[PDB]
Amino acid sequence: CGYVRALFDFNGNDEEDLPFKKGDILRIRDKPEEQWWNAEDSEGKRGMIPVPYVEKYG
- Tell me the CATH number at 43: 2.30.30.40
CA pair distance 4, 26, nearest whole angstrom: 5
Nearest to 23 by CA among 2, 54, 56: 54
Phi-psi category of residue 44: left, alpha or beta, with phi > 0 → left and psi -120 to 50 → alpha: left
Domain total in the chain: 1
Angle, alpha carbons 7-17-33 (nearest 5°): 85
Distance of alpha carbon 9 from its chain centroid, rounded?
11
DSSP state of 8: S
Q: What is the extent of the structural domain holding 9?
A: 1-58
**The residue type at 51:** V
Query: In which element (H, E) is residue 4 found?
Result: strand 3-7
CB of 16 closer than 8 Å to CB of 38: no
